[PDB]
């Protein structure tokens, strides 16, 4: 259905221990495709997906140049925010930035993002309207004033609606085997005694792409959201995702419980019983 491209930037000041550590990663949907680390030997933007490796030197030289610029902006940004917040020259701070675009099923522009956090709190964010800024505090109101003076929102909007979606579409085509795959989950169920008088049913979804999944337990078709053990969807580390949900079943109530699995890769949702 829908798709997204995201860039994530982390800059971390290490005062007295040289220049700040800057790390960048790019994703299409749940798939990493690029990285940059200020500390690594290459000083290159580097591929992390097979389907981007074949981009020629022009692509890589251009991404390297930009990521280096983004790195340098964050270096300055760490100084600015220090000033803004009247904070000690020594002390480690984190500047984070994310930007990217959503396309619908028709691969047309759906939403754009451009936002920052300082030390893990919201600093500034482009609003859904793609023209106004949310400024948390008075510090951000300074950024906001500057960006409003400079019509930053308009220039960004151009990227978000043009390049961002252009190159997302291009990547989805070039990575069609990986990026346009729906891998339905491999499911199974386990049963372990907890005591003389109650046992765990654990319902497993494995090896599925993308990460989006609905995994629920019903007792006589009534949902057990309050009584379900449900882990964070986690990466298997091969491009696929894992999840399970568990319920404690009192003795001889197994037949009352149904596991329901929903995923894009499933034509119709699974009901599983012990």
């Amino acid at each position: 259905g829908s798709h997204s491209m995201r860039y994530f930037f982390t800059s971390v000041s290490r005062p007295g221990r040289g220049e700040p550590r800057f790390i960048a990663v790019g994703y299409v949907d749940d798939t990493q495709f690029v990285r940059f680390d200020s500390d690594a030997a290459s000083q290159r933007m580097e591929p992390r997906a097979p389907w981007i490796e074949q981009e020629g030197p022009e692509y890589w030289d251009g991404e390297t140049r930009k990521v280096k610029a983004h790195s340098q902006t964050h270096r300055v940004d760490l100084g600015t925010l220090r000033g803004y917040y009247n904070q000690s020259e020594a002390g480690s701070h984190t500047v984070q930035r994310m930007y990217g675009c959503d396309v619908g099923s028709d691969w047309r522009f759906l939403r754009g993002y451009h936002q920052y956090a300082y030390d893990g709190k919201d600093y500034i964010a482009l609003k859904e309207d793609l023209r106004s800024w949310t400024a948390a505090d008075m510090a951000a109101q300074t950024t906001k004033h500057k960006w409003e003076a400079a019509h930053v929102a308009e220039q960004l909007r151009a990227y978000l609606e043009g390049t961002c979606v252009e190159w997302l579409r291009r990547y989805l085509e070039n990575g069609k085997e990986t990026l346009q795959r729906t891998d339905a989950p491999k499911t199974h169920m386990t049963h372990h005694a907890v005591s003389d008088h109650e046992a765990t049913l654990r319902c497993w979804a494995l090896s599925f792409y993308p990460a989006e999944i609905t995994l629920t337990w019903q007792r006589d078709g009534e949902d057990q959201t309050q009584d379900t053990e449900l882990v964070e969807t986690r990466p298997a580390g091969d491009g696929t995702f894992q999840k399970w949900a568990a319920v404690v079943v009192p003795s001889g109530q197994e037949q009352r419980y149904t596991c329901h699995v929903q995923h894009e890769g499933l034509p119709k949702p699974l009901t599983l019983r012990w």
Partner: peptide, 9 residues
């Protein structure tokens, strides 16, 4: 593709 503009807080 990264946004080619330099932007500072």
């Amino acid at each position: 593709k990264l946004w080619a503009q330099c932007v500072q807080l």
